[PDB]
Amino acid sequence: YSYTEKKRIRKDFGKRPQVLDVPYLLSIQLDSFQKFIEQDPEGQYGLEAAFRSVFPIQSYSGNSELQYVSYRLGEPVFDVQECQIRGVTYSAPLRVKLRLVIYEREAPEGTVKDIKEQEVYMGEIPLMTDNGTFVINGTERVIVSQLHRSPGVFFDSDKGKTHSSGKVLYNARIIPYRGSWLDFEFDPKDNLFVRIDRRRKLPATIILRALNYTTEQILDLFFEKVIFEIRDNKLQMELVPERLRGETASFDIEANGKVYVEKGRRITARHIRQLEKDDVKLIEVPVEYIAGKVVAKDYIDESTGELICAANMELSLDLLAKLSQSGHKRIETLFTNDLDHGPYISETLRVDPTNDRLSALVEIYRMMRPGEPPTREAAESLFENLFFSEDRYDLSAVGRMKFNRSLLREEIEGSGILSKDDIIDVMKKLIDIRNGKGEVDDIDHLGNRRIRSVGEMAENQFRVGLVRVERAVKERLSLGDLDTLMPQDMINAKPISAAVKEFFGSSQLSQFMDQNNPLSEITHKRRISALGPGGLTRERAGFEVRDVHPTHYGRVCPIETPEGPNIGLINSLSVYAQTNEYGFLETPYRKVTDGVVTDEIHYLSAIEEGNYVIAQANSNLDEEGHFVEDLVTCRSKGESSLFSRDQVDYMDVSTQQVVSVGASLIPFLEHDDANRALMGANMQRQAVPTLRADKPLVGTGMERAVAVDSGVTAVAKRGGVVQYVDASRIVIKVNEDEMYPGEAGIDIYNLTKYTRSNQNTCINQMPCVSLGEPVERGDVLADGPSTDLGELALGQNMRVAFMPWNGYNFEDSILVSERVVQEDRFTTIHIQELACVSRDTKLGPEEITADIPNVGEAALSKLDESGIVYIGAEVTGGDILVGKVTPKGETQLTPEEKLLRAIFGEKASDVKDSSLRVPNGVSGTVIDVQVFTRDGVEKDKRALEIEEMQLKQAKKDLSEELQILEAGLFSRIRAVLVAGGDEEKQNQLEQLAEQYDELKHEFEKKLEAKRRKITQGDDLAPGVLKIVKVYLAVKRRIQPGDKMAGRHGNKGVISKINPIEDMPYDENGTPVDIVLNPLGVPSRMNIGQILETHLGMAAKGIGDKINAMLKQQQEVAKLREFIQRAYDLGADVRQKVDLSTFSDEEVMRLAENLRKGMPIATPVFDGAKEAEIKELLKLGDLPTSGQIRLYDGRTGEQFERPVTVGYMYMLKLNHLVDDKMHARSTGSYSLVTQQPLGGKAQFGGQRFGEMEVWALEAYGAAYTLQEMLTVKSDDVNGRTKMYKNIVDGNHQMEPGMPESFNVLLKEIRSLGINIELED
Amino acid sequence: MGHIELASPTAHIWFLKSLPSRIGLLLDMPLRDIERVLILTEEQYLDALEEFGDEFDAKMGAEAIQALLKSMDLEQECEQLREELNETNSETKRKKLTKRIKLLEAFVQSGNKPEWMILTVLPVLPPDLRPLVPLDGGRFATSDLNDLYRRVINRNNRLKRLLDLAAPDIIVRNEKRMLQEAVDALLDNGRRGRAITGSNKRPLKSLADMIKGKQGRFRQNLLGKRVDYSGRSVITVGPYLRLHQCGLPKKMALELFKPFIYGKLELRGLATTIKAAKKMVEREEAVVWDILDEVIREHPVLLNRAPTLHRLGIQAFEPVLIEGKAIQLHPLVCAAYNADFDGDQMAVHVPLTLEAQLEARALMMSTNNILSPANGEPIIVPSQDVVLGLYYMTRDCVNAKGEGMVLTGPKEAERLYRSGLASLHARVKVRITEYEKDANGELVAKTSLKDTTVGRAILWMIVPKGLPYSIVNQALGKKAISK
Amino acid sequence: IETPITANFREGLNVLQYFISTHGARKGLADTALKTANSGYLTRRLVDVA
Amino acid sequence: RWYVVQAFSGFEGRVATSLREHIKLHNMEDLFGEVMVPTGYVLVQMVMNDASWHLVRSVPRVMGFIGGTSDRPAPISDKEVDAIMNRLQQKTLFEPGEMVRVNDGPFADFNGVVEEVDYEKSRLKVSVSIFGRATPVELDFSQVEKA
Structure with missing residues (x-):
């Protein structure tokens, strides 16, 4: 066991022991990009595959080559924390070794001269963090991995109702990587067909006629x-x-x-x-x-x-x-x-009018490119050039791996180009299935689905940015005869930088991350979305595919699937899913060498898995190697059946291999339903980070790996002892190893506080370990937001009862006590960007106020002397964020202007307006303001003030770095020089003092390189001078209507909160926090809710006892033995860890942190039985019924039956009151028509739709329709002549014409039809 | 309509390309030719042309629809089309005579010229109905409705200038094709490939897509949308409140009901005018609340869900004063809409004027609507905590503390509430004062001692005269509570 | 298939018993979701004949 | 890739078809995929080459290409990033006939030659190149930089 765990240990429960390896979790991203951004010494996937294939390029008939070898990467421009704060893209430069080659006139393979190396800066390309995120414009945005119909030969069913005339179809799908599609088909006349790129039906004879086979040459080669x-x-x-x-x-x-x-x-x-x-x-x-x-x-x-x-x-x-x-x-x-x-081919060759290649060749292009006329050689080019080419067409690796798997062959590799013998067998085996024999193929098998990750997506995006320039390169190489430098000017930084940004900027793939939790963050990185570029659309999807198929097993999780229009389309991977050498899915299985279940594991692919006997997880094992159960439950051929012991080739290893991370953090799936498990895991992503986190006391076991591999919490890389803990930053001496060049180890951690995310929330990192304690390699130092001592908290711990209360819980609603809100538990900061841009002119640039004019009677004292709002201020109402002042006007230049330059005793002319302001209704507090002004024009006092404090810090940090690094080196020398004990003595002090003076340059030159960085990094885009954002934070409180739910699936809204006094009391006099309804529990289904609660009591009942030992000031040996035996026994389990050694310090601190809730770790697939619950209930003096008849805190009397009470671990969710709540009377309108606006921007519209109108009409009411659609919506002026009529109380209606319907008339008028109100 | 734009030829689309034709009917044409010039398959036509020699010549562009109607009429088909049929007799002789009668049965409504099919003048929308969608808030990137109408302007000049500067039919007829390419994208965007492919606009945006984008012009027109004094609201519970009440929030009520709030403050003499009140409104006040306690009883609230389909959506409720954000209501009416309170949005409507205010409290309320319009059964039927509680009391209970102590009527409920004696029991006899309206005429019938349970007997005094009483409490209320 | 489940939601259960329930739960969820469209059409359609 | 063909309002559309007119005369395949008529600015899809540029030079003269340079459209970084690189290079020594790089006012993102060197008034009349021509304007020793 390791350190930091020895503060809050969980009771390690489960039918299965603790000896198995957990992967690095966010490796799928990291281990992908690493390979794609690697200097691979072979034809390997990433860059060197995209380069060795693409560039050995020549001129058009000019014989001026460009031959390629290797590439030169550069130093990063700006770092992670600072530019995320700034608002700049994260990229690095690219030099490239470029040796030119030119052939001589009528000479085979030679070189004259290559001039030089020369090289070009190959634009800018973004990279991945150590956390595992991209950054675009100072906001974190991550691409999701894909699944589509993979390359290779596949067959389809499409039976019966496809025709809807009692007919069965058979069709082909030749899927390449790149180039056109080939769709071979069948008709009801017993014939073969082709539809290249889903176009029109044309015969397959024409293909044979085309590809080296005429009438005779077609028929000779079949059979x-x-x-x-x-x-x-x-x-x-x-x-x-x-x-x-x-x-x-x-x-x-x-x-x-x-x-x-x-x-x-x-x-x-x-x-x-x-x-x-x-x-x-x-x-x-x-x-x-x-x-x-x-x-x-x-x-x-x-x-x-x-x-x-x-x-x-x-x-x-x-x-x-x-x-x-x-x-x-x-x-x-x-x-x-x-x-x-069958008569397929024989009948086809009769139907089609022609015989030779000529016409078959002639027809294809007139069909490929309609409208345009043909030539003789445009025909000869574009067949050889379409399919018989290494450049335009590449079937590459995994295609041919599958293409050659399906056709029953020896060689898995062959020709890079399409060959003469392949399509023949492709044609044949489609008919072989059409005729009758064999069983139909399915894409549903995960064998027929390929993995591309973001690096393989980057791969797909690189080569276009290579080919688009090839045109320019080759066209310049042909016309260019002179050799006055070539790889410097002929290559530009424009097309490489732009073509990459098209995808990483504007796509459904690269989008805003939903960063509101360590879970949310991790799990967006570990998901699959099927809709995107080169795949699914809204046309094809509906039923099938969306549903689970047998081959999923432990690769993809059915639980984490977000609902909406695309239910079961977006799915998440399993905890223990991995990628193949081929680039597929795999699941690990223990080698059963005859009758021995090994510890060493081997992975197998979706096709490779099926043959061997794949077990289920839950099983028993013997001492030497043999099996316990005579007839073990197993799978192999997609179904569960009984098998013998020794015929088993493989075992299932782990419990939670199947289920995903977020889904494997829910306890008792196996007592809950499959129905309610799904909406939990989806809405478990969108949970609010509290200010003070409470933990889960019913844990699982996954929590320790997730938060560490997240990158959210501060992860210690190396091991030593903590120096100076502060709130701001934690510094740690290494002691153990020492660095490579010198100056000791010393680890430093810059803790992030009161920071912003994409979904309007607060992110605060907070310290854990004490003032000067030791630390190991891989221990948590500082917990982030909603995290605590190596455990994921999210929400909190709540006393929850399961009864109605005169129906204050009517319809799955929640009571809540005031002792909830009073303990200051669920407190959160909802943080919002309020930004402003002023300038961008061709006369005068809009000034930074220094004044602000002129309206009211108070505002001058509220705001600072500079122009921006002071560091911290409570905004309430409709005040100003940053600036006003704009250079409008252009009236004249008469006396009156010499008589206007002192009423407004400022500027050159009587001109001042506004920029942007605080919104009406929104009210909050300022924290820290950041300034980004264009390099070229001057800054304000504050833009200096911030960076001046930063320049203090820049010198303070480095001088503080100097303090110990100089002392640590020079004192170690000084102590040994004393321990040991003139021209050469002067020569030593010369060379020493020279090294002292040489060290003096190291810091100054580093400083200068760093001082350059600060002011120069204030230029984002051309034509945006002033970019100042006021960082106003709104702390929202525990209010009625806020989102509350259990982990199992109890969505619910707070009704009205009753006070503490009117809330009840237990036997000991301890009130209940939250109260739920018992009415949802049997309609839709949860038993886990029951179990978690009764175990929550069980966990905290033992917890309540352990405090008393310390509350009485007793301690000494006893406290150990109570905990020892509690961990020693919880109804016959393994992983049993007593407090064996535990001689002070560890115990003292174990108890210190483990008080008022001893946390259990109950598994997911190994969901605990009632014996474990009750034995722990027995350890803590609690009823087996879980039912105590309690005296009401209200009335006083006891209930007739005994009320079940528990702890549900209720959590908070994002869509709170303000998001959904809107109400606006009168004001603003849309631009098309005289109607109000869309929503969540300007006017509080809130649409009615066709559904409510049909409703409204039936309610027998003429006015309550007309008021909504004539009187007070479509007519602005109809409202304004009724604004006249309402206030006094005169009433009566007059509409005229309803305005919006003139747009019916007018758009038809402009259509070229006549509409005029005649008669 | 600002624009004119006179093209040297024409185009239209409704009349060129649509499933029931018009240009195809008035000429005797297919659409496929009116598509490609200006039934068999393509290769069949090319081979049929190859077989039937020459022939051919070649057709023409858009003028070969324009000039066609310059010798075409309406009121004059009726002496001609059936003379061809009259040659291979007969039948049609009468078909004209019927259509002649059809025309003679006018002349109020008539069929108009087929020259109006085709646009020498191409009309364009007005200024206000086509605005720039702003990207930042002042840069004004290309609109979803003008890029193609820049093209209409682009098309007329190119022809009017190269007829002046002289250009070949290779450069002239292709411009007539390119006259049709966007003028046929301008009024319709369907069945063909045109314009920009996904940069700022995802489709193309035509006048056809403005009238039929998805399912007609309901949204802008029929539906009107949005409205003054509108609100969206969430969820609570409400037990202390009545079923003929509406537990509104604090803040949203003031924002919506503004015009009368001031209408009071001005004319009465609370505020000086309309205006010294604004400063008092901007800062929020204690007095405002007191004044607005009066109107709440006088002006109701109409509330609905996000999906409504029945006559059980727009049920309206009398507002009542509450100091809590989330809106409290009845528990019965929730079954009528069909919501289990776990994230269901409740929208608000306006009860203004005097004439419109009649229809609220008289037609469709809770104060009014009870029994089913569709079924003969009740809709006001409870679920969960209501239903249960009643049986939870009304049950043949096992023993309890009591055995059987007899009680009169008013003394009952209490003894069983007081002490020892539970509420459930089973078996206690009572002087129940019942009434049965026999032979038509008010409360007839007398008292009786009858066997029930005890939660039953507690209730049977609340009893305002009518029902069977005790006969009905016996057995259960299983589906009988509704019944 | 030939064989069924044999145990209880209350009791401790097995790994491969939850696969088949999710195979059908996915159907039941799309059932509850896609029907809002068809009803929404059918609500309109009938009223759009009347 | 996308290159912005600058044309003249009124016959700006005429240029967009005059592209497609002359495309057929110099013809082969490729290069021009989808000609956009957005409107002085005509956006045109093209990969860089020698062809079609010769065509534009054969039929002018109102406007040419847009971006960074007329020969090869279309970059995005003008002269401010050049004004950051000049800081490492560094003079207040200005004379008649030396290049004097501007970076302040509406004459930012632009370079120029100093015409008049005033020492008494502390100004440099720096001639900024705009519209294929020159614009002589007084800009301070700081409002400019020595090239």
Whole structure:
């Protein structure tokens, strides 16, 4: 066991022991980007795959090469904490080694001269933090990973009701990475088809006709042949015992001196053997067969020289005379049996009018590009150039891995270009499924779904920014003959920087993070959204796919799926999901080497998994290696069934492999329902960070890995002893290791406080460990917002009862006591940006007030002398944030202006207005203001004041760095020089004092490089001079209507809070905090709610006892033994850890932090039974019923039945009162029509819709319709002539025309139709 | 309508491209040709053209719809179209005679010329109805309604200038195609590919998409939307309040009911005028509250959910004074709308004037509507804590403290409330004073001793005269509470 | 399938018993959600005939 | 990529089709995908090359390309970032015929040559290049920098 845990330990419960490894959690992002931004010494995925493939580029026929090797990265411009605060994109420069090559006229492979290396700055590219976030414009924005239809050969069903005429379909889907789509198909006329890029239906013959196969060359390569023979002036056959199956005998077939099969009957297993055993190769055949059967090859008259039947043509007897008389030894026909080898292809080649390549080639482009006319060589180019190219078309790796998996082949790799032998087999195996045999493929199997993460998405985004410049490069390389520098000017920083920003800026992928919790933050990084670029749309989705399929197992979690229009489309990964070498999903399983469940684990892919026996989790194990249960429950072939012990190849290892992080933090899923579990995990993301956090006392076990791997809380990298703890910053001596070059270790941590997020909240990091204590490698030093001692708090601990209270809990509503609000528990700061821009002119720049004019009777004393609001101020009403003063006017320049320059004794002219102000209704307190003024024009007093304090800090920090680093080095030398004990002695002091003076430059040059950074970083965009934001914070309180819920799924709204006095009392006289309804619990279903509460009491009942030992000042040995045995026993479990050694200090502090709630850790899949609950209830002197008849604090009397009381661990949620509550009388209007505005911006509109109008009409009321739609909405002036009529009390209505409907008339008028009010 | 814009040809779209045609009917044309020039398949036509030699020549552009109607009429089809049919007899002879009667049955409403199909003048919307959507608050990036109408202007000049400067039909007819490309994107955006592909505007925004973006012009027009004195509100409970009441908040009530608030303060003499009151309003006052306690009883509140479908949505309630933000109400009426109070928005309507105020408190309230419009059963039927409590008291209880002590009537409820004797019991006889209106005429019938349980007997004195009493409490109220 | 579940929501249960319940719960959620559209059409449609 | 073809109002649209007119005369494939007519500013989709530039120089003269430089559209960083780089390079020594880089007023993001050097008045009449021409304006020793 480690340190910091020895303050608040949880009771480690569960059917399974504590020896297994947990991954780094946010590795899927990190371990992706690392590879994509790595100097990989092979053709590996990221940059060097995107570079070795793309650039060995030449000129158009000019023979001026550009050959590439390696790349040069640079130093970062600005750092994380500061530029997030600032509002600048996070990017680094790129130098590139560029050696040019030019070939000579008529000479093979040579070099004259390459000038130099030269190199270019290749624009700006963003990077990932150590936390695992991108930053754009000073706001954190992360891309979500994708799942789509993967590359490779796949088949589909689409049965019955697709036609809705009693017909089954069969279709192809050739999915490449890049380039066009190929859709091979089937029709009801037994034929093959093609729809390149979902276009129009055209034959698949045309493809064969196109790709090196004409009439004859098409038919030769399919399969096998019907060899007819004309020998001794009679028709004969070369018969094989394979082809006759599934047919009827038509004629008397006899050979080899024995009669076998006659007319009428069908063939059995008895008849086939007579062809195999007695040897049948050559047989005689009559004429009437050949009357209907179809010729295979072309034949020609050797005498007259004419067409003896074109390919795929039916026969006649008059021809048969001429054709047999001509001189043919070998005649060939087709098979085309309906059951086996169907008439697909044979029928197609007859339908389509043409034969040669010419027309087939000619047609495709006239269809590819309609409207435009063709050429001879535009045809020859764009087929070879479409599909037969390493540049335009790349099937790459994982495609060919799957493409070659499906077709049953030895080689998994082949040609980079599409080859002549591939599409043939692609064509064939589609018909092989259409004909009848085999089972239909499914995309539902996760074997047929590919993982791309944001780095593989960045990969997809890089090569376009490489190809778009290639055009410029190649077109410049051809025209450019002179060699006066090439890789400096011919490359620009514009197209590489811009093409990347198109996706990372404007996409559904790259969007605002929902940073309101460590959970929320982590889990946005670990999700999958299917709708996006190159995938799903609103057209195709509805049913299927959204639902779980068998192959998910422990890769993707069904629990964390956000609801809305796209329910079950956005899903989250499991805790223990990992990526393949191929780039897929995997689940770990313990190798069962015959009858031994190993500790060493091997992963297997979605296709590789199915064959071997994959267990379930819950099982028992023996001593030496053997299995306990005779008939263990397992899976393999997508279903659960019974199997033997030794045939098991693999075991399931862990409990929570299936479930996700946020879902594995809910206790007792296995007593709760699957129904209510889903809305918990979704709304568990959007929870408010409190000022004071309380923890969960019913824990799980996941909490310790999540907060550490989050990057939210301060994580200690190395191990030593804490120096100076402050609120601001914690400094720590290393002692153990010492740094590489010198000057000791020393770790420093800049704690973030009173900071802002994307969803309008507060983020405060707070200290944990004491003033001068020791620290290890990987221990929590400072807890962030809503976090506490290596535990994720989110919400708080609440006394919760389960009864009605004259229905103050009517309909899943909540009471709340005043002792909740009085303990100052759920307190939160909702923080809002109130920003202003003034300048951007072509005469005079808008001045920073220094005055503010002129309205009222008080405001001059409220605001500072400078212009901005003073550091901290309570804004109430409609005051000013930052500035006014604008240079309007242009009246004249008469005497009156020389007579206006002292009423307004300021500026050059009588001109001053406003910028922006505090909104009416919103009221809060200022904390810290930040200024960003353009470099070029001067700043205010405050813009200096902030940075001047920063410059003090800049020198103070470095001098404080100097203090111990000089002392630590020089005193270690001074002590040994005393311990040990002239020209050379002067020479030493010279060289020493030279090193002293050389050290003097190190700090000054670092300082200068750092002092440059501060003022220079005040230039965001062209044409925005003043960017000042007033940081006004609104602390919202525990008010009626605020969001409250349990972890299991009890959404509810506070009714009206009753006071403490009127709230009840227990036997000991301890009131209940929150009260819920018992009425939701059986309608929709929760037993976990019941269990968590009764265990919450159980946890805190033992907790209440342990305090008393310290409240009485008793202690010494006893306290240990009560806790020892509490951890020693909780109804027969493993992971049992007593307080074994625990000789002072540790115990003293363990108790100190573990008081008034001894926290349990109950698992998810190993949800505790009632024996564990009750034994802990027994350890803490509590009823087994969980039901005490309590005297009311109100009336005084006891209830008839015994009321269940618990602790629910209720939490708070985001959408509070103010967000939903709006009410506005009269004021402003929209720009189109004389109606009010949309919402959450200007006027309090709040729409009615078609639904409420139909309602309104039926309510039999003419006025209450008209008032909403004629009197007081559509007409502004109809309101204003009624503003006249209402106040006095005169009344009566007159509308006229309803204004909005003139837009009906007018838009039709502009359509080119006539509307005028005639008659 | 500011614009004129005279194109050297024309276009339209409704009349060029729509599933029931008009230009296709007035000429005898398909749409496919009126689509591509200016039924079989494409390759079938090309092969049919290849087979039927020459022929051909070539057609024309938009003028080959414009000039067509210069010898085309309405009141004159009726002596012609059936003379072709009259050649291969007969039937149609009468079809004209019927249509002649149809025309002679006018002439109040008539069918108008087919020249009006096609626009030598291309009309444009007025200034106010097309504004710039601001990006920051002063930079004014390209609107969702003018980029294409810049094109109408762009189209007329290009032709009027190259007819002056002389240009080939390769440069002239393609401009007529490009005259049709946006003038056919300007009034309709459907069935074809045109304009910008997802930069500022996601689709294209036509006058067709302004009238039919999704499902008509309800939103702007029919629906009106938004409205003065409107509010959105959340959830509570409300037990102390009545069913014929409305537990409003503090703050939102003052914001909405403004015009009468001042209308009082001005004319009576509380505030000096309309104006010394504003300064008093801006700062919030104690006196304001006292004045507005009076109007609340005189002016109701109409409240609904975010989805309403029945005549059980717009049920209205008399406001009553409350000092709490979240809106308290009845518990019965919640079953009528169908909400389990876990995040259900409750919108507000306005009860102004005198004439409109009649229809609130007289038609559709809680004070008024009780029994079902659809069913014969009650809608006012409880769920959860109501239902339960009643049985929880009205039950054949196991023993209890009591056995059986007999009681008169007024003494009952209390002895069982007082001490020892529980509330449930089972089995206590009572002088229940019942009344049954037999043979038509007020409260007839006399007292009786009948067997019930005791929570039952507690209730059976609240009893205002009518019902069976005790007969009905016996058994249960299972579905009988409603019944 | 041939076989069913055999245990109770109150009692301690198993890993692979919750898969099949989520297979159907996902259907039930889309059932409750997508029906608001169809009813919304059917509410209108009938009133838009009357 | 997107390059802003500056054209003249009235015949600004004429330029946008005069693109597509001359496109067919010099024809092959590619380059011009989707010609946007947004309106002095015509936004035109193009990858950089020598072709189509020669065409613009064959039929002018009202306006050319927009961005950073006329030869190769279209960058985004003008001269303020150049004014940050000049700080590391550093004079108040100004004379007739030396380049005197402006960075204050409406003459910011622009360079110029000093015309008149006043020592008595403490001004530099720096000629800023705007509209393919010159603009001579007095800007302080600080309101400018030596190139």
